Write an enzyme that holds these catalytic residues in place. Sequence first.
Site, short mmCIF file in Angstrom:
data_model
loop_
_atom_site.label_atom_id
_atom_site.label_comp_id
_atom_site.label_asym_id
_atom_site.label_seq_id
_atom_site.Cartn_x
_atom_site.Cartn_y
_atom_site.Cartn_z
CD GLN A 26 -2.88 -1.14 0.02
OE1 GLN A 26 -3.41 -0.10 -0.35
NE2 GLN A 26 -3.09 -2.31 -0.58
N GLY A 80 -9.02 -2.15 -10.94
CA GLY A 80 -8.20 -2.99 -10.09
C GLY A 80 -7.82 -2.28 -8.81
N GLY A 102 -7.52 -1.50 -1.90
CA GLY A 102 -7.34 -0.07 -2.04
C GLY A 102 -7.44 0.71 -0.75
CG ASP A 162 -10.90 -4.94 -7.79
OD1 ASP A 162 -11.28 -6.12 -7.85
OD2 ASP A 162 -9.70 -4.61 -7.66
CG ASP A 183 -2.02 -2.10 -9.07
OD1 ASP A 183 -1.04 -2.38 -9.79
OD2 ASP A 183 -2.03 -2.28 -7.83
CE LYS A 196 0.55 -5.41 -11.18
NZ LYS A 196 0.59 -4.70 -9.87
N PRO A 207 7.59 -8.79 -19.42
CG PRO A 207 6.05 -9.77 -20.86
CD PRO A 207 6.72 -8.46 -20.56
CG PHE A 208 10.70 -12.64 -15.97
CD1 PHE A 208 11.13 -11.46 -15.40
CD2 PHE A 208 9.78 -13.41 -15.28
CE1 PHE A 208 10.68 -11.06 -14.15
CE2 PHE A 208 9.32 -13.03 -14.04
CZ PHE A 208 9.77 -11.85 -13.47
CB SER A 265 9.33 -5.83 -7.58
OG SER A 265 8.32 -5.52 -8.52
N1 LIG Z 1 -11.00 -6.54 -15.48
C1 LIG Z 1 -10.85 -6.20 -14.20
N2 LIG Z 1 -11.66 -5.24 -13.70
C2 LIG Z 1 -11.53 -4.90 -12.42
N3 LIG Z 1 -10.68 -5.37 -11.51
C3 LIG Z 1 -9.87 -6.31 -12.01
C4 LIG Z 1 -9.89 -6.79 -13.34
C5 LIG Z 1 -8.86 -7.79 -13.42
C6 LIG Z 1 -8.53 -8.51 -14.61
C7 LIG Z 1 -8.32 -9.04 -15.67
C8 LIG Z 1 -8.17 -9.55 -17.00
C9 LIG Z 1 -7.14 -9.10 -17.79
C10 LIG Z 1 -7.00 -9.53 -19.10
C11 LIG Z 1 -7.89 -10.41 -19.64
C12 LIG Z 1 -8.98 -10.91 -18.88
C13 LIG Z 1 -9.92 -11.82 -19.41
C14 LIG Z 1 -10.96 -12.28 -18.64
C15 LIG Z 1 -11.10 -11.86 -17.33
C16 LIG Z 1 -10.22 -10.97 -16.78
C17 LIG Z 1 -9.13 -10.47 -17.53
C18 LIG Z 1 -8.28 -7.87 -12.18
N4 LIG Z 1 -8.89 -6.98 -11.32
C19 LIG Z 1 -8.55 -6.75 -9.92
O1 LIG Z 1 -7.22 -6.28 -9.84
C20 LIG Z 1 -6.77 -6.47 -8.48
C21 LIG Z 1 -5.27 -6.68 -8.44
S1 LIG Z 1 -4.33 -6.15 -6.98
C22 LIG Z 1 -4.74 -4.38 -6.89
C23 LIG Z 1 -4.59 -3.75 -5.51
C24 LIG Z 1 -5.08 -2.31 -5.43
N5 LIG Z 1 -4.33 -1.44 -6.38
C25 LIG Z 1 -4.93 -1.76 -4.01
O2 LIG Z 1 -4.87 -0.52 -3.88
O3 LIG Z 1 -4.87 -2.60 -3.08
C26 LIG Z 1 -7.69 -7.53 -7.86
O4 LIG Z 1 -8.46 -6.97 -6.79
C27 LIG Z 1 -8.57 -7.98 -9.03
O5 LIG Z 1 -9.91 -8.25 -8.60
#
Ligand SMILES: Nc1ncnc2c1c(C#Cc1cccc3ccccc13)cn2[C@@H]1O[C@H](CSCC[C@H](N)C(=O)O)[C@@H](O)[C@H]1O
EC number: 2.1.1.57
Length: 279
Positions: free
Chosen positions: A29, A58, A62, A85, A128, A160, A164-165, A190
């Site tokens: 955080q 994402g 948060g 999210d 994110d 974000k 990729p490696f 990281s």
């Molecule tokens: N599409 C989205 N819409 C909303 N949220 C989403 C997503 C998603 C995806 C994805 C796909 C990407 C590519 C292709 C796909 C094809 C099919 C289905 C999904 C995808 C992830 N997340 C959220 O990102 C967080 C990461 S950690 C952040 C932590 C935060 N920043 C904090 O402050 O703590 C976590 O909570 C997840 O639930």
Amino acid sequence: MDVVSLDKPFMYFEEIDNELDYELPYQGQLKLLLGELFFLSKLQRHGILDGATVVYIGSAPGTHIRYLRDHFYNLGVIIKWMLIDGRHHDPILNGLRDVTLVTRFVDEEYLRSIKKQLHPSKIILISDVRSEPSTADLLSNYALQNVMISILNPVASSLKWRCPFPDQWIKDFYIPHGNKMLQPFAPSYSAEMRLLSIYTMRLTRVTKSDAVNYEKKMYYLNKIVRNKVVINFDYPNQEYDYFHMYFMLRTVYCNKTFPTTKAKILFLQQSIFRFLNIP
Ligand SMILES: Nc1ncnc2c1c(C#Cc1cccc3ccccc13)cn2[C@@H]1O[C@H](CSCC[C@H](N)C(=O)O)[C@@H](O)[C@H]1O
């Protein structure tokens, strides 16, 4: 920690000037809070943050986003937040009229409807989203981020970005232009950065050689640079990550006046650490 004398930390990936062969409570955080404070404070300096709507995809849990809103709310900057999210957000984000909590995984269709309902207001995108991740997972992630940019058409974005490696390469892909912000208090090795873009969107090809260059430059940063003590640095903690954090926080605005810059950064760090419950 080997001692070093620095005038300024590396703020962006492009500034790393050497390479090496790769081999705190709630720190995540804190990492997100600083980079998003840095990003949004740069936008405030450009006078484009005011009146904007920050769309954070994402965003869950948060916890740190509450500190972000309270910071700009107390500055009088008029900001609407839209946190989207699939997971549930931290309840500390409840009860804020200017914060809209949306429990939904975004796809192309939903991004269209977001844009329709927010147009023509200024959109600032913070992503994110994350799906250990594979290269196909990253490629899908970065494709989704491009889709966010092409649809939402934000005036600025923070995305974000971890390449990729090289030993897991699949294909060349494209990402937006922008500055690759380095993250203090990131995990020890990281190689993740935040791609900061201000749009006046041309894509850039990312090749397996770039993956090699990212891997070696970030390893030198994490092994050598971040394990240094900046002895000339006038601050209670001189470890590089604090030196790095100090230079990000000095771009942050405050309603309160301080006798010195060091007094301001100390106050801000105290406030950030206290909210995040860090000693
Ligand atoms: N599409 C989205 N819409 C909303 N949220 C989403 C997503 C998603 C995806 C994805 C796909 C990407 C590519 C292709 C796909 C094809 C099919 C289905 C999904 C995808 C992830 N997340 C959220 O990102 C967080 C990461 S950690 C952040 C932590 C935060 N920043 C904090 O402050 O703590 C976590 O909570 C997840 O639930």
